[PDB]
Amino acid sequence: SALAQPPSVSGSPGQSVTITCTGINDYGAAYKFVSWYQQHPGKEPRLIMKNVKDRWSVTPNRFSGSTSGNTASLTISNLQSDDEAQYFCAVYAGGFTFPRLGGGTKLSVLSQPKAAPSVTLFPPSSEELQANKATLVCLISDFYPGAVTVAWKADSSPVKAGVETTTPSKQSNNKYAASSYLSLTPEQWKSHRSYSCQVTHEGSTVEKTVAPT
Amino acid sequence: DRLFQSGGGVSRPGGSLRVNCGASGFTVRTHYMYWLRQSPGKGLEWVAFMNSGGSVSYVDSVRGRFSVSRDNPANAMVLQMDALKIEDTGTYYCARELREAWYGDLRDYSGLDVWGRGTIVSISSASTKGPSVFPLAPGTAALGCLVKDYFPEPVTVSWNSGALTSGVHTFPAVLQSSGLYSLSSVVTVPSSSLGTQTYICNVNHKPSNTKVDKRVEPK
């Protein structure tokens, strides 16, 4: 399966940040070649770094890698606005068919103080239920930086099907907004005790719960 | 060394599309090549691998539906996509991987150093469609309008024909896997105004000549 990366890291301009990549030795003892890729929004990925710490082409001295056997690290110093991007680690060894990919880290360069999200969760309306449909609406606003993870639960177990979540987009007040929708059948809605929208942001979580009523 | 792409596009479930991947500076047919895809706002996932000898490996979820072939006169490879599903929507990339291997003994590995810019693939059963508008029932209270399942963009939303603007937040739409859009608009009002001040969201979707005024009432 996949390597483990934080969904997001953030750092202040001038400072340094480290993106970690764990699980490198979950599949054998063969030497692992670790590569890092940078992808700006709307653009294709770019190879940054190979063999943990060997910089690729015109990757500045600011990008360095280290490694702890099971966790490889990419450290970016003198952080600046161009560094805002998604970063993917990859591990290849002899015998792999595909390199293993990490899930990606969104890197944010803080140009203002962090702001926690406000979260509003609406249950399905009886009008929509009458149309044999059910939509849970989770509205997320006023956060910074613009990176959130949204998870849904039915009672206490995670739900993945029927979830549609926007990419965060800048509000007029310079913080961000996002929406997540959980589509259910009316039978699914009524047959559970509650549904929950969980919003993770800079390692903190807000959870809102609704119940058929 | 450059890769360039073309093709892709829009198709109903079950249809077919093709993505091309050509090289300059090197020949596809002597290099290790990869296809990847990325669902919007998500991460990279593998699609197919072609080694320098031309054997192709597929991820399980596309085997039997997708096939990769060499087009040597165009110094290219082609991703033929048949029996398309909703899950196949995304931006598709081809890439070249640099490695040093004698026999099956890898000596060095650089990674995917050359990438195409990506080709958009959209699997959708969507055509022009007006939205269904549902009320989101409400110190202060938050009430709103859910504007569900419309196509194409955009819809506009106002409240009380524009007499109510303070406290309004209309959220960017979500593009669903169906290919349809949905958005919500929510307004924050004094709770003492509920059941004495009427709240109506005015939704307009000019591509389908649909206008909806929904009264949003307290439960």
Author numbering:
A (entry chain L): 2 to 9, 11 to 27, 27A, 27B, 27C, 28 to 95, 95A, 95B, ...
B (entry chain H): 2 to 82, 82A, 82B, 82C, 83 to 100, 100A, 100B, 100C, ...
Paste lines from the article.
The HIV-1 envelope (Env) undergoes conformational changes during infection. To address these limitations, we devised a vesicular stomatitis virus (VSV)-based probe to display membrane-embedded Env trimers and isolated five bNAbs from two chronically infected donors, M4008 and M1214. Donor B cell receptor (BCR) repertoires identified two bNAb lineages, M4008_N1 and M1214_N1, that class-switched to immunoglobulin G (IgG) and IgA. The M1214_N1 clone exhibited the best breadth (65%) and potency (0.19 μg/mL geometric mean 50% inhibitory concentration [IC50]) against the 120 Env panel, followed by the M4008_N1 clone with 42% breadth and 0.77 μg/mL potency and the M1214_N2 clone with 31% breadth and 0.16 μg/mL potency.
Using single-B-cell RT-PCR, we recovered four bNAbs, M1214_N1, M1214_N2, a clonal variant M1214_N2.2, and M1214_N3, and one non-neutralizing mAb, M1214_b4. Competition ELISA performed on CH505 SOSIP indicated a different epitope for bNAb M1214_N1, which was effectively competed by both CD4-Ig and CD4bs-directed bNAbs such as VRC01, VRC-PG04, N6, and N49P7. For M4008_N1 and M1214_N1, the BCR repertoire identified clonally related γ and corresponding light-chain transcripts, but not μ transcripts, as expected. Surprisingly, the BCR repertoire also identified clonally related α transcripts, indicating that these bNAb lineages class-switched to both IgG and IgA, a phenomenon unknown for HIV-1 bNAbs before. Because the PCR primers used for the donor BCR next-generation sequencing (NGS) did not distinguish among IgG and IgA subclasses, we could only infer that, for the probe-identified M4008_N1 IgG2 lineage, its secondary class-switching from variant N1.3 IgG to N1.3 IgA would be IgA2, and for the probe-identified M1214_N1 IgG1 lineage, its secondary class-switching from variant N1.2 IgG to N1.2 IgA could be IgA1 or IgA2. To assess the physiological relevance of the IgA bNAb members and help rule out possible sequencing or PCR artifacts, we purified the IgA fraction from M1214 plasma and found that the M1214 plasma IgA indeed neutralized the same four HIV-1 Env strains as did the M1214_N1.2 IgA1 bNAb.
